[PDB]
C-alpha cells in the first residue's frame, strides 16, 4: 500500500524530535480515591449542565504546577530560551485519520466547566474534521490519555516539538496500601492508583526540576482542595 | 472644628450617588459551617506560605456570580450601558483618615492565595498611605466588611459611583436549624449563619435579577466545591 | 449597548418617587402554618375548578387592612389628599421586557376564586403583551412577590407613584418557636414564617399608623377565619 | 533569556551520547528492610565519628558487582575495548548551577566510612565550586540518586560518556508481600521496596550480562552480610 503522504510529515517531525532532543522519563504513582469522590459529588450536584472527567482535573493541575515551576513551560529556539507566562495545553485525540493535538488556551484560572466544554467541542470538531491550523499549531505543553483502555498500566510518548515536556496517564488499578486501625495493628486498604509518565527534554530541564514538578502535581492531586489555589 | 476639606469631596460624591441612583436592598442568610471547615483545613495543610479569611472566598463567589449574571457587572453612562467582561472588586479599608477602596483586578480565575496576598499588600499600603489613584479609581463592584465586630448582625452601605451594586457582610451568629436524626423524629442543630445585604441601583438591575444573583451566591457558598467551577 | 428608551421613563418615574417622597420601612414576621393548611384543604375540596396561592390571601388581607385603616389607602395631590373607598391592588409581574403592574379592582368583597382567575388572566396577558393602559395605570396600593425564589428572606421595593405605600413578601422559612407541652416544661416547635416589608411615604402616613395597619394584617393572617369578616 | 553557554557543552555531550550509543533499560525491585536495620545499628553504635546513608551501601554493591562481572566496567574507544580493573564511581550532585559528577576512586576495598567522608567532602566542595577537572573527568561507571524526593517511584538517566552504564535509585515505598506464619496459612507483611533502573550501552553489553549484573546486585543487597565478601 503506498503511503498517504500525510504520515511522511509526522514521521519527519518525530525524527527531528528524537534526534534534536534527548529524552528521559519519570514514572510516578498517584492516589485518586478522593478525586473520584469529588468528581462524583460535582456530577451529582448538577442539572445536566455539565459533565466532568479525570483529564480536566489533570489539566488544571498541570497548569498549577507549570505556574509554580515556570522552567518547564519553556522551549528551545535560536540561541535563546523562550519562556511563556500562560499555560497552553495540547490535548491528543485519536481519529480514524490518525492523531491530532487541539489546544486549550489560558488554562490557569479558567474553570473546569469551561475546560470540559472546550475539550468536548474540539474533540467533536476533530472527529468531523473542522479545525483551523492555529488551533493545533503551538502550545507549550502536551498530554496524551488512554484511560478508557484498562489494560495499559503505563506508557511513554514523544515530545511534539518545539515543546519541552509531555505527559501520559495510564489506567486506574487496585493496589494494596497499609492503614492503621483504631488499635495499634495495621490493616489492608484498597486504594485506586494511577501511573503517570512524564517525558522531558534534557537540554532545558534537569532531573531535579522534573522531580519538583512531579511532586507539586502529586501534592495537588492528593489534596484536591488545593486546586482552588 | 473646621472641616478637613477631604470630607467635602466624599460628601458630594455620596450626595450625587443617592440623588442620581435610587437604592433598594436585598437581605439574605447564608450557611458557612462547611466554609469554615474548608478554611481551617486549607490553613492546616500549609507551611505558613499563606493564610486565608472569609472575605477572599466571598470575593471569588462574587466574581462567579457576576460572570453567571453579567447584567450586575454594569454601569450607567451618557445614554449608554457600559458592560464589562472581567470583575474588578473594590474592597473597603477603614483608615484613621477615613475610608478607602483599593481594587483587585481579574478576580475570576486568579486564585485565593494570590487574592489574599494582594489584599494584604493593598491594606498595608493603605494604612501607610502609599497608593496611586488608579488603584482605587475604577472597579465595577464593591464590598464592605465588618466581620471583626461581632455586634453587627446586618447593615447597609452606599453605592460608590459609577458602579451599580455593592455588598455588605455582617458577623457570624449561632442559629437554630432543624435536622432529621436516623429515626423519624426531628432534632435541633446549631448552624453558623451570616446575614448579607446587597444594595442595587434600580436603573440597571431589577428585583428578579438581584434575586438570581443572590441565589447563585448562596449556592456557590453553601456548596463550596463549586468554587472550582 | 444603547438604551431601549422604555427604561428612561421608568428611571425618571422612580427618580421622581424617591426625590418627592421620603421612604421609611417596616419589617415584620408572620406565621402561615394555618394558612397553608387552609389552602391545601380548599385545593383538595375542589374539582379542578380553581387553584389558590398565597398572594391571593395576602391581597384579601391587604384589602381588609386598608378598609380598617383608610388613611393608608390615600395619595398626595395638588394641595389636597385624595382618599378612596375601594381598594385597587397593583400586582407586579416580571416579564422579559421588564416589570409591569396590572390592577385588580374592588378587592374587598370579591372572592378568592375570582381574584385568582383575574390574576392568572392578567399575568398571561402581560406575558403576551396584550394589555390596555388603564389596566396598569392607577391603583391605590401595590405589591411585589418573590416567593418562588427561596433564597430571598427579605427585600425592599419602591413606591409606584402617586400611591403612598407598597408591600413586599419574602420567602417562607423554618424557625424555632417555643411550645408548652401538657406538662409544665417547654418544647421546640417548627413554625413556617415569612418576612414582610412595607414601605410607606411619610407625608401621609406616620409610624403609628403603619404599625396599626401591620398589626391588623398579622391578626387577619394568623387567624385566617377572619377573612370572612 | 540567552543561553549561559555552559549548557551548550552539556547538550552537545548528551546528544553525542544518545546518537552514538543506543540505550536499553532494565528495571528491578530491591528489598532493604535488613539494610535499614543495619544502617540504624551502625549509626547507633557510634560516637558521631561517622554517619551513613543508602547511597554508600549502593556504591559498595556496585563495586562488588562490577568486579564479579568485569564486562560492564568497560568502555568504547577507537576500534578497541578498554577494560579497567578497579571501579571508579561518578556520583551526581545537583547544584543551582546545574549538574556535576565528582568521582570516588578505588571503591572495592575502601571502607564505608572513608566512602561517606569522601562523598561529603566532594559534595560540599561542589556546592562551593572548588573542584579540579580531574575530580570529575573520567570514571568507569556512574550513578544518580533521588531518594530524598518521595514522589519518584522510578526514573531513567543518560549515560555520561565514554562510559557504558548508569544506575538510578528511586525512593523507598511500602509494598505487600506474602509470608508464612507458623501455621499453614499465609499472611500479609509490609516490606520496604525500592525500584532501581539501569541504562546500558548495547554495543558492549547484552541483556543477559546486564541481567546477571542486576542479579548480583540484588543478591548482595538482600543479603547485606556478603558486603564483607
Curated annotation (Swiss-Prot), chains A, B, C, D:
This is Dihydrolipoyllysine-residue acetyltransferase component of pyruvate dehydrogenase complex, mitochondrial. Belongs to the 2-oxoacid dehydrogenase family. It is found in: Mitochondrion matrix. The chain holds residues 230 to 458 of 458 of the full protein. The active site is at residues 202, 206. It comes from Neurospora crassa (strain ATCC 24698 / 74-OR23-1A / CBS 708.71 / DSM 1257 / FGSC 987). Its main location: mitochondrion. Binds 1 lipoyl cofactor covalently. One of its GO terms (cellular component) is mitochondrial matrix. Keywords: Acyltransferase, Lipoyl, Mitochondrion, Transferase, Transit peptide. Its EC number is 2.3.1.12. The E2 component contains covalently-bound lipoyl cofactors and it participates in the generation of acetyl groups from hydroxyethyl-thiamine pyrophosphate-E1 and their transfer to coenzyme A. The pyruvate dehydrogenase complex catalyzes the overall conversion of pyruvate to acetyl-CoA and CO(2). It contains multiple copies of three enzymatic components: pyruvate dehydrogenase (E1), dihydrolipoamide acetyltransferase (E2) and lipoamide dehydrogenase (E3). It catalyses: N(6)-[(R)-dihydrolipoyl]-L-lysyl-[protein] + acetyl-CoA = N(6)-[(R)-S(8)-acetyldihydrolipoyl]-L-lysyl-[protein] + CoA. One of its GO terms (biological process) is pyruvate decarboxylation to acetyl-CoA. Coiled coil: none annotated. Its cofactor is (R)-lipoate. GO terms for molecular function: dihydrolipoyllysine-residue acetyltransferase activity.
